[PDB]
Amino acid sequence: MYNCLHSFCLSLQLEVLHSQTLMLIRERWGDLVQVERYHAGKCLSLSVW
């Protein structure tokens, strides 16, 4: 039970963070941050400066 609901919640958190980065790139930042890698449920990697 812990494995199933912990894995789902953590990948949900990663999906929320990816959606937030797409909001920041579209609205206010824009090429000051870029998504390098995104594997859904596995990893997210952003590039600044």
């Binding site: 494995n3 199933c4 894995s7 789902f8 990948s11 949900l12 999906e15 959606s19 859904a40 449920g41």
Partner: peptide
């Protein structure tokens, strides 16, 4: 006499949960 349209991503995550954790009767 709704659906907030961020549910595509949640649904793909549900399918990944189905695969990563299968149901067991």
């Amino acid at each position: 006499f709704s659906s907030i349209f961020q549910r595509q991503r949640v649904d793909a995550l549900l399918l990944d949960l189905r695969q990563k954790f299968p149901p067991k009767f």
